[PDB]
């Protein structure tokens, strides 16, 4: 179910503000979020 979960979370989380570091020119890293190898590239959302 995890993938089905992740989309649903993202479709929610991203609508809330945006990441300010996105405009610093520094790419975000692929932080792991579970076992089996799943990864997420995301800057911290700061500006709502």
């Amino acid at each position: 179910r995890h993938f089905d979960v992740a989309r649903i979370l993202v479709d929610q989380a991203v609508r809330l503000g945006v990441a300010e570091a996105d405009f610093s020119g520094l790419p975000a890293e692929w932080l792991a979020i579970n076992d089996y190898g799943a990864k997420v590239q995301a800057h911290v959302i700061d500006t709502y």
């Binding site: 996105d22 405009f23 610093s24 020119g25 790419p27 692929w30 590239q41």
Partner: protein, 49 residues
């Protein structure tokens, strides 16, 4: 053997993409969003590159 691979694509000062980068998958790089999200603009950036 050992085919070369596109690894990353970068869009600078583009409409919707000021300093955007996409890490290009080895087999499947799927970009999805709402309609009008600049998706066509991303493919356009690649092809014009």
């Amino acid at each position: 053997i050992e085919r070369g691979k596109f690894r990353s694509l970068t869009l600078v000062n583009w409409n919707g993409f000021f300093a955007r980068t996409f890490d290009l998958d080895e087999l499947v790089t799927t970009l999805s969003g709402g309609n009008g999200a600049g998706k066509s603009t991303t493919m356009a950036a690649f092809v014009t590159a």
